[PDB]
Amino acid sequence: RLKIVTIHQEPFVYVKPTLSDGTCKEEFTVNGDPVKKVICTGPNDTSPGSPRHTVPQCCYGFCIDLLIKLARTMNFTYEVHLVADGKFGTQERVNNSNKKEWNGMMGELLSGQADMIVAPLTINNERAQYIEFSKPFKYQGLTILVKKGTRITGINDPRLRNPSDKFIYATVKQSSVDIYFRRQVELSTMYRHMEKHNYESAAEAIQAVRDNKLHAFIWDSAVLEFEASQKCDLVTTGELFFRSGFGIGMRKDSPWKQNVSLSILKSHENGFMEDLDKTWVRYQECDS
Ligand SMILES: N[C@H](CNC(=O)C1=[SH]CC=C1)C(=O)O
């Protein structure tokens, strides 16, 4: 039985409590089909001061449908959990030493706490030095989420390039976004500004934009375009930049990689990815 690690990230992975009987609420898509739900164990409270408890929860969304299809096609059983520290994964010095380790889903894959990462996980060369990716199951990039009305053109807008205190922008801590900004000498002062204000999760950042506590949120277009399309008060702005895919993550020289990539190819070829899009990404008007 493979250990799948994932992360909360709508519309790819919804996370809800079980009902009182430990089951998952019966729900249907806009088209009347049952929403497929898997049990995922993970933390159910990330509020500072409250005790962390790992409990069974209900998971569903684009990546969960994708998982179910992979499991069927490649004849494997699995169990899903949510990444313990809440993070995608960056490489950090451990224990105040010069030794480095990966946190987030990257760390769990490398340590053996997971066998496969099934998540909106960005494919980049930094990560590919340590793990293997499938071919992209989705092609996307970064964009910028703002409140409707906000006068920002893109990543090259002077308000971003020349930051003051009167316009706060941020991304999510311990994602690959800070790495990409740090990997160009041009974008240095943006990275330095963001590090001061970054959020523990996308959901918190998004909420902060809604609540006028964050002016601009730099994040995956596949998530932000959904969020902005779901919430009439929120918009995206600017051209996509740092175009890149989402992939399945596996350890180096994994015997799963080739067949995972083959499954994803088939899904691109036969309309399955577009069906997922029509189920999870584009299906109705904004209703927050
Ligand atoms: N998908 C998340 C967040 N997105 C990213 O880091 C990036 S960097 C360049 C393009 C997308 C992740 O895997 O950490």
Can you tell me about this structure?
It is found in: Cell membrane; Postsynaptic cell membrane; Postsynaptic density membrane; Synaptic cell membrane. Belongs to the glutamate-gated ion channel (TC 1.A.10.1) family. NR1/GRIN1 subfamily. This protein has two domains: about 170 residues, D-Maltodextrin-Binding Protein, domain 2, CATH 3.40.190; about 100 residues, D-Maltodextrin-Binding Protein, domain 2 (3-Layer(aba) Sandwich). It has ten helices and 14 strands. The longest helix has 13 residues. It has an eight-stranded mixed sheet. A four-stranded mixed sheet has the order 11-12-10-13. It is about 30% helix and about 25% strand. It has about 290 residues and is of the alpha/beta class. The structure holds ligand A1ILR. The ligand N[C@H](CNC(=O)C1=[SH]CC=C1)C(=O)O binds next to helix 5 and strand 13.
Write the layout of secondary structure elements.
Blueprint: E1 2-6, E2 14-17, E3 38-43, E4 54-60, H1 62-74, E5 78-82, E6 91-93, E7 100-102, H2 104-111, E8 116-117, H3 125-128, E9 131-133, E10 138-147, H4 158-161, E11 169-170, H5 177-182, H6 188-195, H7 202-210, E12 216-220, H8 221-230, E13 234-246, E14 249-251, H9 257-269, H10 272-280
Parallel strand pairs: 1-5, 1-8, 3-5, 11-12
Antiparallel strand pairs: 2-4, 3-4, 6-7, 8-14, 9-14, 10-12, 10-13
Residues 88, 120-122, 142, 175-177, 180, 220, 242, 244 line the site of the ligand N[C@H](CNC(=O)C1=[SH]CC=C1)C(=O)O.
PDB class: transport protein
Keywords: ion transport ligand gated ion channel, transport protein
Assembly: monomeric
